[PDB]
Amino acid sequence: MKTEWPELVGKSVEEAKKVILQDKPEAQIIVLPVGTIVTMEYRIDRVRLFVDKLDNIAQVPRVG
Amino acid sequence: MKTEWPELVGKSVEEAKKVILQDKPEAQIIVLPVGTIVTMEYRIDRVRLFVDKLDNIAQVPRVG
Amino acid sequence: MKTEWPELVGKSVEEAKKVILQDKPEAQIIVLPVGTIVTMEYRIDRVRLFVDKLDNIAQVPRVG
Amino acid sequence: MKTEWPELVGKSVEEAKKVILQDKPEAQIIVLPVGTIVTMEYRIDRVRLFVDKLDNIAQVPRVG
Amino acid sequence: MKTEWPELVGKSVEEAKKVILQDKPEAQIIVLPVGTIVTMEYRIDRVRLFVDKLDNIAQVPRVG
Amino acid sequence: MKTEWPELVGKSVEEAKKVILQDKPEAQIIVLPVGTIVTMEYRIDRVRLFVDKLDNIAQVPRVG
Amino acid sequence: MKTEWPELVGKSVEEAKKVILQDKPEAQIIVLPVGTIVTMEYRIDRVRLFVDKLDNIAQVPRVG
Amino acid sequence: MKTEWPELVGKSVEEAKKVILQDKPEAQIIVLPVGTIVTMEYRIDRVRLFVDKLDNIAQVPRVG
Amino acid sequence: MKTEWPELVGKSVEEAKKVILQDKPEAQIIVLPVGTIVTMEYRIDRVRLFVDKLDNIAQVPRVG
Amino acid sequence: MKTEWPELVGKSVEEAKKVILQDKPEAQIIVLPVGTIVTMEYRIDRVRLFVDKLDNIAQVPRVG
Amino acid sequence: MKTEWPELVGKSVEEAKKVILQDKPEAQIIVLPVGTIVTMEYRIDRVRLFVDKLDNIAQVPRVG
Amino acid sequence: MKTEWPELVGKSVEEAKKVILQDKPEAQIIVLPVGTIVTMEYRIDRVRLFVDKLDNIAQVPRVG
């Protein structure tokens, strides 16, 4: 089961959403600034995007 | 008594407000960024929405 | 002496200011985001409003 | 020597600047959000204003 | 292998992106405010830019 | 070697940049909000400006 | 249903546990330092005690 | 698959470890203070215990 | 009504408790480290002591 | 090159040091509480252990 | 009026207290860990010592 | 002028103090936990050691 997208580091949100949804059609894509305090529970259909000032992906997206 | 809305993760605020108010007509819906420091007391009619950069629900809404 | 306004949770700032000033004409109404670090001294004429992303009251206003 | 302005709690920045400069013509008036982390040294000509979301004075201005 | 760009302190993002990509064509350039909490893993193709209020580079860019 | 500019407390960024560059032509001037977490290394050509909500200098600029 | 114990401010943990359990025999009593970051869910049988350096109750215990 | 232990709120670590390991023999039991900043990845064999000053469980243990 | 004890800055807790209770026999004296995050409500019988590493009073005790 | 030790989650520091040094004889093993703010540079011979209250490994050790 | 003691960086608390009290007999000497959040008012008779893990002075003591 | 000691990562404080003082006899050696908030000014004779739970050097000591 695809769980990480190292290939999207540096890409836009638009491009990240497109690639994740090809790979994971049920994905719930959440867009947060880098450094956001996240204590959440594990959601296997959620993919968090941690984004820089220009809304580019700053770290490896992972399911959860 | 309905207390959680896992079905609204990834949805907009507009859609979350609509579904919560169908389920809970007295709901006081509060919209906060993910990571917000919340020490509050329990309010049985309040539903907090924790939202990402695009105002989509990032976690499971719960009464309180 | 009126000290709390549980009835304003979920309401706008405009409506909160209107109701507080009917109840407390000397009120100094201060509008802060939820989660704001507040070490202040007690001011009996001040009412702090802790507001969400849409400027609705997220918690019970109290004098102080 | 005037050191505190409790009378400006709830007032605007414009009004606070006007009153402080009548009382203290050399004042260097600095406008910060409530909750700002301040480790500074003491400056006898500086007056910090701690302001809420609407740029009203949320606490008692003091020299320093 | 080029790993630091002390020459870009004080320069714009545009100029930093241009110089880094001449030196490192595979660079994934990420733009963050100074003071951002970064616990990340090491990515040898990523260059983080820590920027001030005017989007000028405030510290030495480094690979990672 | 000029290292501090107490005379710029309360002044604008424009005026601070002008005075610092007269005094220190190589200066790399960085503009940050008051309260910004700064763990940096010492750069003898850098001058950080810590600015309030109105982009006035809130503390004594120093080299580093 | 008893929900707050203002009478225990300043008292020890031992005394607080004794009084709470007389009033609320099912109580799960949790002892935390003042200032502890608490995002928890509401537990109607739990009573949190926020304690100072000497393990005296520093604020009003409340159910939750 | 057992995922939460609401029955251990208020109990000791010793008792929590005993009950969790009966229910989940592969459990890796980790003991942290309440309020600990946790950005971790999901580990299906790990159970975190969030403990108060007296090493009693302050919140519902959950797998992850 | 006595509300501040500037005379106890630098003194021990023992001495502070003794002087406060002479001045304010109903006082509930709470001992916290400097820098403790305090969002509390106003309690007119409580006196908080903010103490350094050696349990000496580091700031002016005040009622609240 | 071995870079992660998922097998040490839940184990002691003693056991973690032993296994890491078998796998990586040059390892510089650093022992930190979970939640420690780490902005460091990448050191290929360093292995950080993030430990719980009982000095057991709470997360997957990784080189860096 | 003596206001800073750069000569005490690296020295013990005992030695710092001795030198400060020779220079400033009214001094109220307060001993805090480095990194302590200090929003205080200016006290001209107080000297704060910011100390490392071994109770040595880590920064220049200053009046205030 | 020697400014960094990468060779002391993983070593004890005792050993770090010994090596630094051979290299830099005027050194003022300060011992802080990793993650300590440091806004200080530059002191060319000071060497800060950032130490883990076992008082081993966790990062590269540098002058400042």
Author numbering:
A (entry chain A), B (entry chain A), C (entry chain A), D (entry chain A), E (entry chain A), F (entry chain A), ...: 1 to 64
Task: Give the exact sentences the study uses for this entry.
CI2 is a small single domain protein of 64 residues, which has been extensively used as a model to understand key concepts of protein folding and stability. L49 and I57 are both part of the folding nucleus in CI2 and very important for the stability of the folded state of CI232. Here, we have applied an efficient in-cell assay in E. coli to select variants of the barley chymotrypsin inhibitor 2 with increased stability. We, therefore, determined the crystal structures of all four CI2 variants in the wild-type to L49I/I57V double mutant cycle.
When wild-type CI2 is expressed in the bacterial sensor system only little GFP is produced. Analysis of the pairwise interaction energies at the residue level suggests that much of the stabilizing effect of the I57V mutation originates from an unfavourable interaction between I57 and Q59 that is observed in structures of both the wild-type and L49I. Previous stability studies of Ala mutants showed that there is strain in the native CI2 structure between I57 and A16 but not between L49 and A1640.
